[PDB]
Design an enzyme around this catalytic site. Structure first.
Site, PDB file in Angstrom:
ATOM      1  N   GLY A  33      57.018   6.208  44.929  1.00 31.99           N
ATOM      2  CA  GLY A  33      56.736   5.962  43.526  1.00 31.99           C
ATOM      3  C   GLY A  33      57.501   6.811  42.530  1.00 31.99           C
ATOM      4  O   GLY A  33      58.500   7.434  42.863  1.00 31.99           O
ATOM      5  N   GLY A  36      56.347  10.787  43.282  1.00 26.02           N
ATOM      6  CA  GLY A  36      56.175  11.261  44.637  1.00 26.02           C
ATOM      7  C   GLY A  36      56.118  10.094  45.585  1.00 26.02           C
ATOM      8  O   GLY A  36      56.422   8.963  45.213  1.00 26.02           O
ATOM      9  N   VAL A  38      53.917   8.490  49.299  1.00 26.98           N
ATOM     10  CA  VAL A  38      52.635   8.563  50.001  1.00 26.98           C
ATOM     11  C   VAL A  38      52.799   8.215  51.467  1.00 26.98           C
ATOM     12  O   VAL A  38      53.561   7.314  51.824  1.00 26.98           O
ATOM     13  CB  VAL A  38      51.592   7.620  49.360  1.00 26.98           C
ATOM     14  CG1 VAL A  38      50.233   7.724  50.062  1.00 26.98           C
ATOM     15  CG2 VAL A  38      51.432   7.940  47.892  1.00 26.98           C
ATOM     16  N   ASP A 149      45.556   3.033  30.944  1.00 25.09           N
ATOM     17  CA  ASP A 149      46.505   2.132  31.585  1.00 25.09           C
ATOM     18  C   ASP A 149      45.916   1.473  32.806  1.00 25.09           C
ATOM     19  O   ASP A 149      46.572   1.319  33.830  1.00 25.09           O
ATOM     20  CB  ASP A 149      47.788   2.852  31.998  1.00 25.09           C
ATOM     21  CG  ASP A 149      48.900   1.868  32.338  1.00 25.09           C
ATOM     22  OD1 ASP A 149      48.908   0.770  31.730  1.00 25.09           O
ATOM     23  OD2 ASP A 149      49.734   2.164  33.220  1.00 25.09           O
TER      24      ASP A 149
END
Length: 342
Positions: A33, A36, A38, A149
């Site tokens: 992303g 970072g 995952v 958001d």
């Protein structure tokens, strides 16, 4: 004097080097992303599968460092079943000189609503999912934190349709803003916490119909789409606008009345349509709060007031206004990592 803390091993995940404690094994790439990446891993202390997020160069700028710090504080502060939280935080670093990044350990969630959107939703499934969204929002709002958001991609879900809100409290050319409140898109009056309830409304409508409620190639286009649903607002609303030009535009439109929401949503139950009508409300003082929405009859099969908890204390980031140096932010972050306890 070390390369990394004892008990850490080096391993490639998705063709990038991770440094993990021995207790987290079988790291498996999940996604990359903006801030970072995952992976999933097994905590050999229990055999539980967890998600681990490796922050990418959080100290590259004061902006990124500040965001990383705030995110850590936010995740630590909240303690709610429908809000993503921390199982652990660590860094391989042995000192500040060595401090380049850190890792967040979180409950593993299989997917998110964006991925399963379009699949058919019974009203029961919508009741369950939206109820969980609203409990999570009630909680973070009670701590003085808004999402701003909220969208399907920020709603993590597992196989049992348990839900957790991601990426809260951290809010150009023409980014999509399909789920954003009109007062945010148009900045035509100040928003309150019900900005997130507009988003819930949009997400619920999409689960009901299978179609994104509002789109648009520019803000005026999206406004036009919104007013097709809300109707052109009347005098009580118009008097609250702080944008004189927007007010004039609204007063000069064909003054098309609102709803019927049972007509706009021809397959929705009366309780579903009624709830939608109360969330997709332009007037930010009349729009439902999360707490109010939770009491709505739409949630009667699932409602448990005991689960609708509030944060005991407000989120308090003293350094939120401060402009510090990356080194200073690092020390603050470094300190916060040590103090953590599961």
């Amino acid at each position: 004097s070390l390369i990394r803390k004892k008990g850490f091993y080096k391993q490639d995940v998705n063709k990038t080097a991770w440094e993990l404690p021995k207790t987290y094994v079988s790291p498996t790439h999940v996604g990359s992303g903006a801030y970072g990446s995952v992976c999933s891993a097994i905590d050999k202390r229990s055999g539980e599968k967890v998600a681990i997020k490796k922050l990418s160069r959080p100290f590259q700028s004061e902006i990124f460092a500040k965001r990383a710090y705030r995110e850590l504080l936010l995740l630590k502060h909240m303690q709610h079943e429908n809000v993503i939280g921390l199982l652990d935080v660590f860094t391989p670093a042995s000192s500040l000189r060595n401090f380049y990044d850190f890792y967040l350990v979180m409950p593993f969630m299989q997917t998110d609503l964006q991925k399963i959107m379009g699949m058919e939703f019974s009203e029961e499934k919508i009741q369950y999912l939206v109820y969980q969204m609203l409990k999570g929002l009630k909680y973070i709002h009670s701590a003085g934190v808004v999402h701003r958001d909220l969208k399907p991609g920020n709603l993590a879900v597992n196989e049992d349709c348990e839900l957790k809100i991601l990426d809260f409290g951290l809010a150009g050319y023409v980014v999509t803003r399909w789920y954003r409140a009109p007062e945010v898109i148009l900045s035509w009056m100040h928003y309150n916490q019900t900005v997130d309830i507009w988003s819930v409304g949009c997400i619920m409508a999409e689960m009901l119909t299978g179609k994104t409620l509002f789109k648009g190639k520019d803000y005026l286009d999206q406004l036009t789409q919104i007013l097709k649903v809300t109707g052109v607002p009347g005098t009580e609303f118009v008097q609250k606008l702080n944008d004189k030009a927007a007010k004039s535009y609204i007063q000069s439109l064909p003054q098309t009345p609102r709803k019927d929401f049972t007509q706009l949503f021809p397959r929705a139950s009366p309780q579903a349509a009624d709830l939608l009508e109360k969330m997709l409300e332009l007037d930010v003082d009349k729009r439902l709060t999360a707490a109010q929405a939770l009491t709505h009859p739409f949630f009667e099969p699932f409602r448990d007031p005991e689960e609708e908890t509030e944060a005991q204390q407000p989120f308090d980031d003293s350094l939120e206004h401060e402009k510090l140096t990356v080194d200073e932010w690092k020390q603050h972050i470094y300190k916060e990592i040590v103090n953590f306890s599961p």
